[PDB]
Design a protein around this ligand. Structure first.
Ligand SMILES: NC(=[NH2+])c1ccc2[nH]c(-c3cc(OC(F)(F)F)ccc3[O-])nc2c1
Ligand SMILES: [Ca+2]
Length: 223
């Protein structure tokens, strides 16, 4: 997260860190046994870390659970990142409480102007790499479709939305992929891609979760 602030330990209780011997992506806990992340974060050997704040130190509240299976959306396209969503089922259910809690899926899509909270342990520099130890937060608004499409002509599908600042300086970045975009207490986006990080006129692009709620419910129900 570039231009963000330290969230404070366990203030974002649905945030998870996907770890394969190091933190590589974020995710959101939606029920005690399922996490939603981005299909481009897929890999085998995933350990889901819940109740985390400092990813390099065990300080208490952490729950490390291995993933039993990861389900990448069947229509995920790695070249366009269309349908960039993945569900991970945990080997055992997490103990939910106030430091570890799930986030609700939306009943409707959010409109431009909605203010949302994006969080993660991704890069905090737009030029160079600086990865934090603790969770960073950023409040960003969803942009209108014309500004999004004008920023990335021909690369935005109806399963994507832009959120951020066209003036630059504040944005999600590498390491934040797979993490949550929560607006009015509902999970509306998944950090997906962007051109560089916090560059002027190049906002972040997020998977539009309201278009996958029926798929998420049907898939969890049959697995
Ligand atoms: N500007 C943004 N809002 C943004 C958000 C997530 C990103 N994730 C990545 C990303 C970049 C990668 O390429 C690299 F390893 F060469 F840097 C790899 C994975 C990513 O998720 N870039 C990103 C940019
Ligand atoms: Ca820790």
């Amino acid at each position: 997260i570039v231009g963000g602030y330290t969230c404070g330990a366990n203030t974002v209780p649905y945030q998870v860190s996907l770890n394969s011997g190091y933190h590589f992506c974020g995710g959101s806990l939606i029920n005690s046994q399922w996490v939603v992340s981005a299909a481009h974060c897929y890999k085998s050997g995933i350990q889901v870390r819940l109740g985390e704040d400092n990813i390099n130190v065990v300080e208490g509240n952490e729950q490390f659970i291995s993933a039993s299976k990861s389900i990448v959306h069947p229509s995920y396209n790695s070249n366009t990142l269309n349908n960039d969503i993945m569900l991970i089922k945990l080997k055992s259910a997490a103990s939910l409480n106030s430091r570890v809690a799930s986030i609700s899926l939306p009943t409707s899509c959010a409109s431009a102007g909605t203010q949302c909270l994006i969080s993660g342990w991704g890069n905090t520099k737009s030029s160079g790499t600086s990865y934090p130890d603790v969770l960073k937060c950023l409040k960003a608004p969803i942009l209108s479709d014309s500004s999004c499409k004008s920023a990335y002509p021909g690369q935005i599908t109806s399963n994507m939305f832009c959120a951020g600042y066209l003036e630059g300086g504040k944005d999600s970045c590498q390491g934040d992929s797979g993490g949550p975009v929560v607006c009015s207490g509902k999970l509306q986006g998944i950090v997906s891609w962007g051109s560089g990080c916090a560059q002027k006129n190049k906002p972040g692009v997020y998977t539009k979760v309201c278009n996958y709620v029926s798929w998420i419910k049907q898939t969890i129900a049959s697995n």
